[PDB]
Design an enzyme around this catalytic site. Structure first.
Site, PDB file in Angstrom:
ATOM      1  N   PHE A  29       0.808  -1.213   0.000  1.00 44.22           N
ATOM      2  CA  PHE A  29       0.000   0.000   0.000  1.00 44.22           C
ATOM      3  C   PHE A  29       0.847   1.273   0.000  1.00 44.22           C
ATOM      4  CE2 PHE A  29       0.680  -0.351   4.588  1.00 44.22           C
ATOM      5  CZ  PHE A  29       0.925   0.953   4.939  1.00 44.22           C
ATOM      6  N   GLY A  37      -2.337 -13.405  -4.707  1.00 44.29           N
ATOM      7  CA  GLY A  37      -0.912 -13.352  -4.444  1.00 44.29           C
ATOM      8  C   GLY A  37      -0.310 -14.739  -4.240  1.00 44.29           C
ATOM      9  N   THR A  38      -1.012 -15.577  -3.480  1.00 41.30           N
ATOM     10  CA  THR A  38      -0.567 -16.944  -3.195  1.00 41.30           C
ATOM     11  C   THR A  38      -0.519 -17.738  -4.473  1.00 41.30           C
ATOM     12  OG1 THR A  38      -1.418 -16.968  -0.939  1.00 41.30           O
ATOM     13  CG2 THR A  38      -1.098 -19.116  -1.985  1.00 41.30           C
ATOM     14  N   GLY A  92       6.512  -6.052   0.411  1.00 39.69           N
ATOM     15  CA  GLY A  92       5.535  -6.144   1.480  1.00 39.69           C
ATOM     16  C   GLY A  92       6.158  -6.606   2.779  1.00 39.69           C
ATOM     17  N   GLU A 111      11.463  -7.620  -1.411  1.00 39.90           N
ATOM     18  CA  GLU A 111      11.707  -6.298  -0.853  1.00 39.90           C
ATOM     19  C   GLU A 111      10.847  -6.190   0.400  1.00 39.90           C
ATOM     20  OE1 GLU A 111      13.506  -3.597  -1.978  1.00 39.90           O
ATOM     21  OE2 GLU A 111      14.327  -4.404  -3.874  1.00 39.90           O
ATOM     22  N   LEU A 112      11.415  -6.491   1.553  1.00 39.86           N
ATOM     23  CA  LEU A 112      10.594  -6.708   2.737  1.00 39.86           C
ATOM     24  C   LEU A 112      10.833  -5.615   3.777  1.00 39.86           C
ATOM     25  CD1 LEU A 112      11.052 -10.620   2.960  1.00 39.86           C
ATOM     26  CD2 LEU A 112       9.525  -9.252   1.487  1.00 39.86           C
ATOM     27  N   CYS A 161       9.216   1.970   3.950  1.00 40.72           N
ATOM     28  CA  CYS A 161      10.053   0.827   4.308  1.00 40.72           C
ATOM     29  C   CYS A 161      11.373   1.333   4.906  1.00 40.72           C
ATOM     30  CB  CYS A 161      10.318  -0.072   3.090  1.00 40.72           C
ATOM     31  SG  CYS A 161       8.833  -0.799   2.342  1.00 40.72           S
ATOM     32  N   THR A 162      11.808   2.491   4.419  1.00 48.39           N
ATOM     33  CA  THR A 162      13.050   3.118   4.854  1.00 48.39           C
ATOM     34  C   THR A 162      12.885   4.135   5.993  1.00 48.39           C
ATOM     35  OG1 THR A 162      12.834   4.842   3.196  1.00 48.39           O
ATOM     36  CG2 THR A 162      14.068   2.876   2.581  1.00 48.39           C
ATOM     37  N   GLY A 170      17.290   8.221   2.054  1.00 43.29           N
ATOM     38  CA  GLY A 170      18.117   8.710   0.963  1.00 43.29           C
ATOM     39  C   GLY A 170      18.431   7.620  -0.055  1.00 43.29           C
ATOM     40  N   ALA A 171      17.847   7.762  -1.246  1.00 48.16           N
ATOM     41  CA  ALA A 171      18.021   6.830  -2.357  1.00 48.16           C
ATOM     42  C   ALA A 171      17.526   7.471  -3.656  1.00 48.16           C
ATOM     43  CB  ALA A 171      17.277   5.520  -2.099  1.00 48.16           C
TER      44      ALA A 171
END
Lengths: 509, 509, 509, 509
Positions: free
Chosen positions: D164, D228-229, D244, D266-267, D300-301, D459-460
């Site tokens: 999301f 998704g599964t 996620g 990407e967790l 996430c960051t 920062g990315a």
């Protein structure tokens, strides 16, 4: 009497062209040098005039470009990329009319004029991504607590001298790359394509202005040998990119070397096509035709030599004659014209002399050889058979559509005959033989910068580095890591440790 | 009276040297040119003799080398890498005696003599891996059914001209890289280091012979300017790598440009060290001393300009003086000795000349300045204060241990003073400021090929490319992608499809 | 009774092997686990014994390796390379006796045993160069006053599990690369090549110990599934390189993924050779034979499926049958021998099972099919015709020399048949057709990790990445940028400016 | 009742949204699964509805996507580049309304919503250039008459599951790269940002249709865990890019590994900022604030742990508290607002549980800690002092604005505390110390995928690869050679010689 003053050509005004144009741009427009009139090679009518650069104009412009560099080099490469992206968009917006101007002033057919502008659009879109990639490796130092890094920085001012035959794309290749690399540019185009130079510069200037950047980042100084030589001798020109004749390029390379400058030389070609016994002839004939007569044989990559194996030589020549006959000649703005005029009346004189020498050196003209009786610089596309491979005229680069055809028997000798000339730009073989193909690409193969298989000598896209070897000069433009010629390498060691050097007996502190 | 005929120098025989040696190798040993005697700078005694190359020797050798290339170029790169691995091992086996020869004939101290051989050994082990890596990208063509590949192939014969000050390692960098890239080599070393050239060539010849390869792959023609000029003008020398003075290098570059050959120029330095106010003085003082007096100031990367911030200037200069007086002087091969003689008597004369020139231009000698009263070409390591940064003798490269010290106040002016000279080889700042470091490494920073932080001007390892900008000549050796200078790039398009080109209205077949 | 106690095998003592050997190394030798005796498959006699790791052994060793990593990771990569160079030389000095042990204990012929050690030697020399090269780009940040760098650092402990069939080279590949990448290693080899693991480890240990480095940098813990499972489940094992069966590899991959560890999987193959109608048959037949029967068909890359165009099927089969009958069989240390024993008695039984299964599925044994009448684990190299390409036994990997032969008609179906199996390791076509070749290499072509042309399925050198797709597991070893799997990437932004972020209406400070 | 049915939100129709929207696209629009209503998190009102995918919709869509691939994979990469360029342009055209939708459905402030769209625009422009660069090296074979090339080809169908919090840019990163690499895509976005997913897919669908490409090249299947599964288990999904929670991602990783598929994970993050004694506190305080409360702590960051040297701890915490007090809270589309609502009510509940848990583990809430009494999912941004670095709640990722603050004294312990958590995404230090900075970047420094200096954890840029290590999953998106994850490597050896293998005693032909 100027074409721009005829309502038929009002579209010229969409490029911001007038009866008399300023040929110097450094943020402002001017020009105190001689006024040049350029002409349409299809009818030799005057198009418009351009005020060229005086020495004072050149001096002022170099200084302004170098001041603008201080601002430009400080802008992050990705942001420089964004400017270059907008330049591509502004060209997109003007592609048809700019293409028409290239056809009108230079003489190539419209699809090639448009295509040349598309080439610049494409290298811009390419450079945008590259602007996020340029740089060097972080390397592992052998020293504990040290970093080892390779840095790339702009050289400063890149001078760009271009030829008549690609009056947009060659500049574009150098401009888009030099820009994302943090350099400013100073353009001097061929005098006979002055309107094209002004029109492109008007397009870029508007993008710089809209982004509140000094216009001298992409400076223009129209002029001829006087301005070209000044650039070659000028220590403020950190890199000089030169596209043109081998004879002039040699002198430019000397002048640059004399001052320990950098040069990028893209010079003449004497490009050969070799057709082996096993070649697809349905591929060879049209490939040869279009490489040979395309742009009236005025490409650096034009096929000027055709080697055909003995077993198929007569059939290929016969099919080529039957095909030349169908080449459609007309004005370069006439729809479906395949073939337009040579750029100058001088090029017609070079054409005729070449055909005369060929005939007298023992060659036979199996097709063409004559001037067409019509306005403009039109000559018949020409095929000459019977010459020795080492014939004087065949080793000469004549910028006209004359295709010299030779027989061969074996692979080793004809590879040698490819390699025997002074130029080293493009080369092509037509064959199905897996082994022969990889020999051709190897150390005993073609010695050229462009080495093609089952595609003619003009086969090249922006992804790869473009340029030739030997008397072609050694420069590369556009793709791969050509960008490195536009920057300077530093090898940087960083001691981040509190470690001291060995005292070696000496009492310090 | 020859040192090689004295028992103390019997070890020379382990290198295959005798009283009079052949100075030409091309598979056979020879030499019909003038016989030269080389002298030990430590005592001005003759060591031995070398028969140099005549014109005929040179002609025969170039021809044999180019014939051997036909074989060598057909040998897969990794198998070429295996030969270079063996050269590395043969060097390992002789590292002590060869190192000793370098000290004897050239005059640098023994650990640097040995260190220099280690350098060649190290680039060999590096080139071994590289020999499995060299090549270019396969790129995606914009055309269906086409491949686009960047190929790299040997240029052919690489001429290598080297200087007296690094008589083993420079040739080695060139040799190992040129070899794995598929080239044959022709070496002409400095005439005053002829025995070193012969000794190295004997080591390599044995490896080539043992591998049943033609020895001409690594040819040697000892000579001076006449042979060097021959190589510069020789179209058969496909790449000329030149290490030497800027004055000679400029003429070599022009001669090679005149013939559209390739050159790799490694020329003069005028390297600065800059110490900012926040510098670790305990790091600065020894770093400055060693980079200034190392090899008696005869490195290309020798620190010849020292900028010190005004707040710390006097303390750095006083500490440097006290450190200079603790330098241990003597025979280069003697242990604990840090400082040997200048290479030639002429060098001593140049040394004195520069010191008087600096005093005349307003300089103050705060240490040294004189010739030492002892055998050999020994002069005092020298420190000069008071000159303006733009003093002429300060801008001139004098290959002697003289260190010009200047004050500065701010970063922008002193970065500009680093960059203001014609040379562009090495540079160092000593500082702790993170911002200053990245500005130094950036577009408004050092313009040199080597840009260091908290390590002096001789900081450089195998892994990076080595070379400088501006009048240093632009060439790179050793690491990164310096290998590309020894090869030619081709951009190759392969149509593997059965697709015919657009007929464009013409009726083919 | 033990071969090592018989005078004819006294050469085993040159590898430091004795009647009972320590199979655990971590700086110290030990082994409190199960004692295993390994057997020569050529004569079914016991060679010598190895004391395997207990759980406490494994626990202690992991801890010692990870302690040792603290030191090893601090050693600069180029100096790590020097250790790997020395390991290369140590293998060189023992190459004959080591290769002889590989033949003795594993059963492959002497030239392949020696060859496998040469493979480890070669990747060492490769890794030495790589050790000065590993790292990432410095990239141009979009933000003013920032640096952007991609760093690579070791993952920590690299567990390495290997299979019986390449008991030296697989470990060697992983070891050489992991080491220069700054990792420590823990090796668990196949229980049936324990002496080979101990002997290799003895050679590496001496090099480490001679360099005053902790031996646990290259740890050995001999054991079976229990030790392997522990490695797969151990969070302290940062990367687990697994070479072995698909059945076990799947469970290893799942276990590592469960704990968010890293795995590198090199699993089974079901590799196909495809011969088109235009193929050079004098190339096809020996390529197929040597790829099918080499190592008694026990390579991961062994050719197991042979597709032949209908027009040449019978001829190629007949020529293969005629050629199989001349295969020389014997003790793998006899040099006339092309063909050695299978690794176990179980393998012979499974050979028979597959032959019988093939007959049951409608296949015809046209050559071989039987156990040979002699001591040791010898079977006839075997050819089966008439099976459908989707026969179950043909989609099964049986580690035995059984080549299943299929007819095909056209390109598209046979590419699909190559791809239809679960495995995706190696694949080869034999053809002269330029277009077919590039389609095979393209997106609609082979789906394998190794995709060859006019060379069989065992065609691979250290220069490229080695490994497969699909159920082969996805890992890569050796060349290209395979080294990245042994390191962690970090993307790093360094703000070196004095600039402050926007206050966005908030009053700070 | 529906916001989309209100005149104030008439702009939503510019994205082609209506009351009830089809949530499946495969060239046709549909959706037979459940109808979901999504809500504005700022006031909890329904916006509009999306018809999700049944199992049948999914099945048909996967099949149509794989059919489309046959056409798409045949399109030359640079031409796929041209399609992605046009996608960037179409996004450009709708950047304001699309960004407004992001603020409305997801809840981040306007400048970030628009910023997210710009991110997708930028990666498109980058991918354009990369589409002429992707590929591998041609390598020098050790074998005479062999070519060795590394090829890269599309994996086929790339499933993309997104979260999301970045409902546009994460998909865009995956899409732009996957597309130029020749894959087709299937997107399943978070159910609570379905309108965003549809709106993006409408934009792309138009570009593909205008270019007469099958729309299934960029397929959409809206749904929850069931879709998704299914993607995780589906062998036809060659690569599954999953973004996620660590919890779900772990199971996705296991399902994909079970079928030997490829995954790109990407967790979660548990990102630290570390302020050393020498840090610029004017730089630290706002960097901490914005990285902690940005996007209401839902990146996430997002900075979740703040370590401060004991000497400056109280000062920074006090200054941080005063700055938090000035954060402007309101509707995310409101121009003056910095801080909007959490995405769901469940998020508010989790936030509450975390704060209460932090108190029960001995933390002290020094700012915030309460749900805000107002419409929406608003919570106060929160700061917690007094916890030990290894408190359970601090090792936990709670996707909410809670900042855990810790004291430290020395570098070594605080690098370890950064590294001790299971997550490995982003990390920052603020310091001026050169040594510390390069230690941070080295093998004993941060173990995360993003490692920053004097810039916060968010920062990315697109130029570098984006992703983390350990429980963050290992995948990389966007820059550097992240593209390789979307392709399969083959190592290809081409024998072009007429050379037959050695007979080894066998009589062939």
């Amino acid at each position: 009497t100027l074409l721009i003053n005829q309502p038929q050509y009002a579209w010229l005004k969409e490029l911001g062209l007038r009866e008399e144009n300023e040929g110097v741009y450094n943020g402002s427009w001017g020009g105190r040098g001689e006024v040049i009139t350029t002409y349409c090679p299809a009818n030799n009518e005057p198009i418009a005039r351009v005020r060229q650069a005086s020495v004072a104009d050149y001096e002022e412009t170099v200084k302004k470009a170098r001041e603008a560099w201080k601002i430009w080099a400080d802008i992050p490469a990705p942001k420089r990329g964004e400017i270059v992206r907008q330049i591509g968009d502004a060209l997109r917006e003007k592609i048809q009319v700019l293409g028409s101007l290239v056809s009108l002033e230079m003489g190539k057919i419209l699809v090639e004029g448009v295509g040349e502008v598309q080439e610049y659009v494409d290298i811009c879109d390419y450079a945008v991504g590259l602007s996020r990639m340029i740089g060097g490796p972080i390397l592992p130092s052998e020293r504990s607590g040290h970093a080892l890094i390779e840095q790339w920085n702009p050289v400063g001012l890149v001078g760009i001298i271009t030829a008549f035959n690609f009056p947009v794309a060659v500049y574009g290749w150098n401009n888009a790359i030099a820009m994302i690399c943090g350099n400013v540019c100073l353009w001097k185009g061929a005098p006979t394509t002055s309107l094209i130079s002004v029109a492109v510069t008007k397009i870029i200037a508007k993008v710089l202005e809209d982004n509140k950047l000094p216009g001298a980042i992409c400076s223009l100084t129209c002029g001829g040998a006087d301005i070209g030589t000044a650039m070659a001798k000028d220590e403020r020109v950190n890199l000089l990119s030169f596209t043109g004749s081998t004879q002039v390029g040699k002198q430019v390379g000397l002048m640059v070397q004399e001052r320990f400058g950098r040069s990028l030389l893209e010079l003449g070609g004497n490009n050969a096509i070799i057709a082996f016994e096993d070649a697809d002839l349905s591929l060879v004939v049209p490939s040869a035709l279009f490489a040979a007569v395309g742009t009236a044989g005025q490409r650096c990559t034009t096929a000027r030599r055709l080697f055909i194996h003995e077993s198929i030589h007569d059939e290929v020549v016969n099919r080529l004659k039957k095909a030349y006959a169908q080449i459609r000649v007309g004005n370069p703005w006439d729809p479906n014209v395949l073939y337009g005029p040579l750029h100058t009346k001088q090029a017609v004189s070079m054409f005729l002399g070449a055909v005369e020498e060929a005939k007298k050196e023992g060659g036979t003209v199996v097709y063409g050889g004559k001037v067409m009786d019509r306005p403009g610089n039109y000559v018949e596309p020409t095929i000459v058979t019977g010459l020795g491979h080492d014939a004087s005229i065949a080793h000469t680069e004549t910028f006209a559509p004359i295709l010299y055809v030779f027989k061969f028997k074996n692979e080793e000798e004809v590879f040698a005959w490819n390699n025997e000339v002074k130029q080293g730009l493009s080369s092509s073989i037509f064959t199905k033989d897996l082994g022969r193909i990889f020999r051709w690409l190897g150390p005993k193969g073609s010695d050229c910068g462009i080495v093609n298989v089952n595609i003619p000598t003009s086969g090249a896209e922006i992804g790869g580095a473009f340029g030739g070897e030997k008397h072609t000069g050694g420069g590369r433009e556009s793709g791969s890591d050509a960008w490195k010629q536009y920057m300077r390498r530093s090898t940087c060691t960083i001691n981040y440790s509190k470690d001291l050097p060995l005292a070696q007996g000496i009492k310090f502190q």
